[PDB]
């Protein structure tokens, strides 16, 4: 859960940077991929507890 | 217990599928970036490989 | 005065070479920027240079 | 005196270009500062520049 | 005037050393440019230098 919060904040920061315009679209795609990976990891951990 | 575990496995697999699809999209974007840079003249063949 | 003129011509040649490389970099970055593969900050920096 | 005037105008143009790029960068940093996504040290450095 | 001449000759030697190392780097990059193992941007920068 802590990792998910941190990764979501990082993704939001990257999206803000792109919207203002500081980084290319590849960084945004990479951040979104990392966020999706973290979501899958959270689902796996929940199922492990169950 | 087996039924419960097998039910949870499917949802885990769905989430993994979504994550891997997004990762594939990001990798394709990076490859297109490398190819465009190579064609323009700012990259080498090793980068696109 | 001939020596002074030659020195001025050399300085002009150096400045022209710097301008040429800057223009080449600007053209390449403008080629890349059209479809969002480099940051706008890099393009602005190249334009300023 | 015409040559001296031209040289001074060129120097002024160079300074203006540097000021323009610095202003663009500081404007982008100020835009990003609202949501606490850049350290205040970076914004202070950009403002000083 | 002899002292001034010596100072000028020393400055010329310094400039010649810088030119020599730049030319060596350019010559080394030229061979790699043939097989697409160095990006054209680096070669252009070396040529400008």
Curated annotation (Swiss-Prot), chain A:
Coiled-coil positions: none
Subcellular location: Cell outer membrane
Deletion consequences: Cannot grow on efflux substrates novobiocin or fusidic acid.
Domain of life from the UniProt record: Bacteria
The record's note on its domains: Forms a continuous, solvent-accessible conduit: a 'channel-tunnel' over 140 Angstroms long that spans both the outer membrane and periplasmic space. The periplasmic or proximal end of the tunnel is sealed by sets of coiled helices.
Family the entry assigns: Belongs to the outer membrane factor (OMF) (TC 1.B.17) family.
Complex and partners: Homotrimer. Part of tripartite efflux systems, which are composed of an inner membrane transporter, a periplasmic membrane fusion protein, and an outer membrane component, TolC. The complexes form a large protein conduit and can translocate molecules across both the inner and outer membranes. TolC interacts with the membrane fusion proteins AcrA, EmrA and MacA.
Function: Outer membrane channel, which is required for the function of several efflux systems such as AcrAB-TolC, AcrEF-TolC, EmrAB-TolC and MacAB-TolC. These systems are involved in export of antibiotics and other toxic compounds from the cell. TolC is also involved in import of colicin E1 into the cells.
Protein name, per record: Outer membrane protein TolC
Annotated source species: Escherichia coli (strain K12)
Residues of the full protein shown: 149 to 198 of 493
UniProtKB/Swiss-Prot annotation, chains C, D, E:
Subcellular compartments: Cell inner membrane
Coiled-coil regions listed: 1-49
Disruption phenotype annotation: Cannot grow on efflux substrates novobiocin or fusidic acid.
Function recorded in the entry: AcrA-AcrB-AcrZ-TolC is a drug efflux protein complex with broad substrate specificity that uses the proton motive force to export substrates. This subunit may act as an adapter protein that links AcrB and TolC stably together. It is elongated in shape, being long enough to span the periplasm.
Assembly notes: Monomeric in solution. Homotrimeric; interacts independently with AcrB and TolC as well as AcrZ. Part of the AcrA-AcrB-TolC efflux pump. Complex assembly is independent of an efflux substrate and appears to be constitutive.
Family, as annotated: Belongs to the membrane fusion protein (MFP) (TC 8.A.1) family.
Protein name from the UniProt record: Multidrug efflux pump subunit AcrA
Name of the coding gene: acrA
